[PDB]
Every structure is written in structure tokens, then in C-alpha cells.
Write a protein that binds this DNA or RNA. Sequence first.
RNA 1: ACGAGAACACGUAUGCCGAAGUAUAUAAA
Lengths: 117, 117, 205, 205, 288
Amino acid sequence: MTFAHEVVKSNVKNQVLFNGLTTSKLRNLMEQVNRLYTIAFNSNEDQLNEEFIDELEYLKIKFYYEAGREKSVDEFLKKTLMFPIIDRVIKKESKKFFLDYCKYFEALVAYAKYYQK
Amino acid sequence: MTFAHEVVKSNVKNQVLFNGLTTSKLRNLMEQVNRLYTIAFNSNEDQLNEEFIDELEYLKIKFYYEAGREKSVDEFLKKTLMFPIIDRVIKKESKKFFLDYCKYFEALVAYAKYYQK
Amino acid sequence: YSKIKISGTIEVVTGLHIGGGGDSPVVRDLQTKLPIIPGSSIKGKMRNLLAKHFGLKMKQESHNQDDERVLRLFGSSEKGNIQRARLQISDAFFSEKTKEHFAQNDIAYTETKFENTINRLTAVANPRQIERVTRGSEFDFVFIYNVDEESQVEDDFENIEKAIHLLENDYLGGGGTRGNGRIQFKDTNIETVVGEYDSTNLKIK
Amino acid sequence: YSKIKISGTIEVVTGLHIGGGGDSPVVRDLQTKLPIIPGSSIKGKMRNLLAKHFGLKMKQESHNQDDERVLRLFGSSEKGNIQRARLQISDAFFSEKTKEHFAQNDIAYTETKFENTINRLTAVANPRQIERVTRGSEFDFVFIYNVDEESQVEDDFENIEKAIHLLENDYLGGGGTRGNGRIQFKDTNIETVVGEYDSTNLKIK
Amino acid sequence: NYEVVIKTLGPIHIGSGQVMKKQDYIYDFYNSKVYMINGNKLVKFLKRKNLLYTYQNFLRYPPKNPRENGLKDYLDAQNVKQSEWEAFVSYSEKLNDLHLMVRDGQNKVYLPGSSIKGAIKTTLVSKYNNEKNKDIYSKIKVSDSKPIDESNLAIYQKIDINKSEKSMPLYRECIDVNTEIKFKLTIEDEIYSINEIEQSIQDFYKNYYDKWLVGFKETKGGRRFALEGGIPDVLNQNILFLGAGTGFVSNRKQAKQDSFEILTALKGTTNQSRHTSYQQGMCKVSFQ
RNA sequence: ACGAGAACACGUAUGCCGAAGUAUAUAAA
């Protein structure tokens, strides 16, 4: 699933990225991710709150909405396996895996931000 | 929960959505729900004021009006149990359940928007 | 140095659309989810107008180096000069009277206004939706004045009252040209919160 | 030899940007990932403003010389006569009450207000984005005061009263003139943690 | 820094995008007033009479009988008293669909800043032949209107005024004749001065007259309005069409080709009360 | 009865300063 983190370099075509993705269009997603990263990080146990499960549900909702608004975001989310990993993280409900997803997503964001028009 | 998720994929037929539902057809409902959202957020206590109960009553009236206006909206509201959920929300008179309903309906709308002609 | 406070209220005459956060939303707080007028907006607008009232050559404009007295009033500290700002503007917050008034009259806080463009030799419309703060709402502000020297306080508040008048007949926000953004000022109060200076002869209209 | 502890909470009125990291993020603890107010910020702003209160000539400004008793309170120990510092300002940390509050009501710990710049002769805008700590946040602070000389307790606490009061009418962090970072102090406390000194006649508003 | 006074010569509409359906009105065939209904008060009445389930089902699956598909009949079937039927009216004007204007927070109609510079821009572009008028758009500022009390709101039917008159099936609410509406004007480009703006509008109107307004003659509604409005003198007056509902036009061969392309016939209003036709849009503007 | 034994890498100072989320965008039918 790290090939999903370095697919970003395989997606530098001719020049636009992800067919015109800009990090600027990722802002709402980044904000929500940071919010719940902080909230999870302060948490003690590995078992997540049921309210936190509902929060993750709200994450998937927002991801789908953003994929609906913009096509480049849609390609980014679909081909990098974002949706299955979100579902899987919701399935295990363990803190460390949620942090693992957070590190993957942040690595994606930063590396994509390296290349922009 | 996210019954919205599998319901929205259950309503993809042959292509029509809820027999032709479109995002333009829910604008008024979205506006009303948003205003009730902000008003209830402004509230401090969990007990719902009788004025907010009357707001919920008028919201029910508006669902029924729109469902009588168009057939596809009627099928959407009927299968998504909007009417039973609103009745239960009115019965409970708790703010947190109303916010949970808000999140559910937002997810419904987001899915309906992501799957469109 | 003593500090002289200015408190008051912005009345929303016609719509107001900051929309820094963006269908095309406006700037809103997150502790109450009720809109605000960022202080940066007010400060920039007053600085632009009060600069324009004084001299402004293409060179002054070239590098945001402005007339010496407005510079004194708002601080530059760039051209090898010691100038920290002397006038502090805070944010404006949806007031309590407004919230109660709109609750007990059942009126929303935000209008969603639909706009179109008509293409030339095409007569085809492309619609837009712009969301603006509802009229007649009031926000409250607080300003802070610092007295770095005693013998420019009267002159500086003369400048500030001129600026407030200019704002009272101008627009703050987005697209006043297209319609929204006139404001008015009410309930100016002047106190010297810390120090030993008198706030009786000093006035702002 | 006694030590007196001063405790309370800082309530953010308008968004605060310390932001020592430099986009433009705020200082954050690396164990909780929450914003902090470094104690150097409090000490420096109190230093500066209470210095500018008393005499501060151009010669004093150039050689960083200050008033004898502000120096006594905060210590110089550079040259001339060495005065060891006497008031220890600690950092402030994001309180658990407000943590429960914002977790329950689902409010972000940080807003990213977007700001603009209208340069002259071009009117072309170039945007920027700034992180700011949400209002209603509460930070818990501790001060420690050492009694090196018994007879001077009253004057020193008088001066720190001046410091608190003057700070409440000023800003912390950046963008102070742009609206940002006004604070208030609330629920203060004085108690003798070490020694044989009474601290009942003491007050800080 | 000027105040602008607007004298509505004819019915003026600014469409809000809200199209009322078969609900929230009573259409009195026999006294010719339509009664908008407060949603809140009406439904809380329904609950003090415990008929809300009846009202909801009434709405939900309409009888399909056109005489039985309104709101007045719904209220009558429950024998609701006319005084109470007067108790539950939010507001009224003298209808399958009805088009509402923009409204402010307190349901108070106002004139937008988009419309007023819409007409003013159009006037400037035509007079100066688009002399960088897009740049001067930023240097001419119009404030929104003050509110418009419902003392000057009434419904009108769209009339297709050609050599034989035809009605459009729906209506549009409009401002009544002769209403006085003010806004405030600010100028950041002194070149297009107040008198310059007024003369630009006037020249636009005169060109409009000698191109199109002369052609609709020999139509009964035509010469009635053309003469009643006094347009031969109006060539001296500062008259302009605001908002929507004015003719699409607001040489002949190029106009024909363009109009074919666009559409790929005059819009006005006819009253029953006085049998007098007004074309939608024109109003008088004077500055101060 | 240990090339020992005394010995605070201490003291002074903050993320500052100027920046408007702006410009067009007839609510057509």
C-alpha cells in the first residue's frame, strides 16, 4: 500500500498533476484530518469511541462529497485506494492503525504539494 | 450506521436515480435543515424549546409538501424512512438526536450528489 | 504609555459579504458558528481610504510606502524607521441583541442571493449564488489607542473621525459596487482604560 | 525565604497567533498536539509594555537600559550591578475543561482564516492563510515570585498588577494590530507554597 | 456620494428564482386577490384544529381534479371560517405559478445592486460603444435599495404584445405604478459624471425608440401605452428598463440573425382593473 | 588512607513588522 503513496510520482503527466489537482482543493479534507488526528492522539486507549466511529463515518461522507465536487480529487481518491483504507480503518477501530492512515495521508499531501504548477 | 451508503447503492436502477431524483429537487429541504441546524447549535441546553418543536413540526409539514409536489422525492422520503425518523425525533425532543439526524441526512444528500447524470 | 479605548457598533445597512472562507460561504467563527467581520478587513479598508485622502503618487503606491502621518497612525517600521502601530483594531462579533432579536422575530442570519451573467451577443445566462450577512444586524467592535507621545493625540483622533466618516459613506466587504457593504457607526464610547489621561474632550462621529 | 504561586486561566478573546514554527502554524506541544503560549511571550510583553510605561529615553532604548524596579522584577544580570531575576513566568497549557468543551460540541481547535493583500498601482490581490487559536480557549498559567527582600513585596505585586491590567488591553502574538490575540485573565489565585509569609492581603485583577 | 430617486413608471420585477407551486395561496376568481399564507401560523392553526394529517394527505396525492387542486378548496372542505381564513393570511396582492421578487431577512422586498448597475452598465456600454466600460464598472458604485413595504406589491400577467395580443400562462409579481425608491450613488471615475450618465441613459432610450418602440404601432395595447406613457416627451426624460421582463433587445438584419441565435413580440402587462397595458421595466431616474 | 576536595553552561532578550479574500459575474427564461 506504499505503492499507493508513491503512485503520486507515477502520476506526473504532460504539465498537470493528477489531471490538475492542487493541494488548495484538498483544504477541507486536510482540516478535518488534522482535527481528528489531534483528538485521537490525545486519546488514551486503542479502542476508539463509538462517537469517534461516527466521526470516521463523517470522514467518508466528506471524502465522497469532495470527490463529487472535483474530478481531480476524485481520481486521487479512487486510484490511491483511499476509500478501501478508510473502510478498513473504520473496521479495526484501533488507534495505531488510525495514526498509520494519518501518516500515509500526510505523506501523500506533502509529496503532492512538492509538485504544483 | 451509514444505511445511507448501501441504500444509495440499492437505488441505482436501469439509468435513473430514485426514478430520476436530482440535486436541484432538494434545495428547499437542504435550506430548511441548515437553518434548523444553526438555530439548534445556538441553543445551550439539550431540552428542546417548544418553539424549536414548532420548527420541527413545520419541517415535517415541508417534507410532506415537497413529497406531494413530486413523485421521486416521495419515493426517496418513503424508502429512506425520513418520515418515521422525523416522528421519532419529535417524540424524543433531544438536541443530540436532531444533530445525528442532520448528519444522516447530509450523508444521504452527499451520496445522491456524487451519483448523478 | 496610557491606552485609550474605543468601543461601538457596526450596523449592517445592506448586505455584507466577506467570504474569506470560500456555495460561496462567508467568514464564520467556529465556537458559535455565527459570522464575524475580521479586523484585518476593517484595518485595511480604513488605511486605504485615509491614505487616499492624503497625497498618493504612483511611487507611494509602488511599494506601499504611504504618507508620513498615516504611517505614524498605522505603523510601517520598514524604511529604517521606528514605527510600531498606534491604533489596534479587533474583530467584530455577532452581538447578543441581534441574536435575541432575530430569534424572537424568526429571521435568518444569512441571505442566499442568486446572480446571473448575460453573455454578449449570446443572451445566455450563467447563474451564481452569493451568500451575504443579513441586513440590520449589528456587530460590536473595540479599538485600542496607544499614546506614544502626548502632543499628537488630538490630531490623531481628528484623523480617525475623518476616517470613520469616510467609512460611513463607503462599503466594507466584497463587491460594494455590485450592491452590498454599506455600514454605519453607533454608540461610540471613549475611555482611558490604563493610565492617567482624560477622555472627556475627545469625540468621534 | 518564601515563594508565592500565582495561578489562573487565560481566556482567548480573539484568535491568537504565537506561531513560532514559521503554513504559518502555531506552536504546539509534541505530546498533546495542542497550542501553547510560551512563557517567553508573557515575560517579554510584560517587560516591554511596563518598561514603556516608565521612563525609556532614546539612549536607554539604544543600550537596552530600563527602569530600576522593572529590572528588579525581571532581572538584568548583564553588566553594572547584577540583579538576579525575581518573577518566574512559566508557560501556559491548553486546559482540560476547554478540551472537554470543544470535544463535546465538536469545535475545531484551530481556524485557518484566509487573508488578502491589495497592492497599489496594480490592485492585484495575492492571498495568504493564517492559523489562529479559537476563541473561548482557556490556558492555565503559573507564576512564581521569590521574596528576596521582605519589605518590597507590596511594591512588586503593585507593579505586577500594573502588568496584568496593561496586558489585558494589548495583544499577544502577531497580527495584534490586525485584530488578533487579545486575552483576559480570570479566576486568579495567590497562595504561599513555600515558607512563612502570609499572602492574604494580596490581590491581582 | 449622491442619492438616486427612482419613479417606477411601470411594473418592475426582479426574479428571485422562487416559483410558487399550487400551494400557499388563495386565488379568488370573484374578487381578484390572491392571498399568500404564513406557513407557521397556518400549520399551528391546523394543529389547534388537529387536521394536519388531513392537510398533509390532501397535499400528498392531489385529487387530479383541477377544481379540487388548490388551497382555498382545501381550507373550505374543513369549513374553516373566513375570518380565521382572514386570520391566517400573511400578505396578499390583487394562477398556476407565481414568481416572487428577492426579499430581505424580514420578508421585505428590496432592489438589488446587481439589477441597477445591470441597466446602468447596459446604458453606458451602448453610448460609449464599450469604451473599456468593464474597467469603469469598478469605479461606479451603487448601494442596494431601502426596503419596499408591501403597500406597493401586486401581481401581473405576462403579455406578449404583438400585432395580435397573447397571454403568457404564468404571472409575475411586480412593484405597483409610481412607487418611489431611493438608493445611494458613489463615483470613483469622475470622467463618467452624473450628467454624463444621465445623457448616456437618455441616448440609449432615444436609440431604443427609433429602432424598436416605433414598430409596435397599430396594436390596441400598443398605442394605448405608448400614448399614455407620453414617450414623445419621454425622449427628454431619463427612462430605463430595470431587471428582467424587459424585451430581449433591451441594422435590422443583424438584429434578426442575433435574435434567431439567442432564441434558438413584446413583454408587457395588461390590467383588468383599468384595461390599461404597461410594458414591463421602465422607470424614471433623477440624481441629486 | 582515590591527581583529590569546594564548583547551578548561568544572566539579558520572542515569531515580530506592512499586508481587504479582491476584480468583473442584468436572477435570462
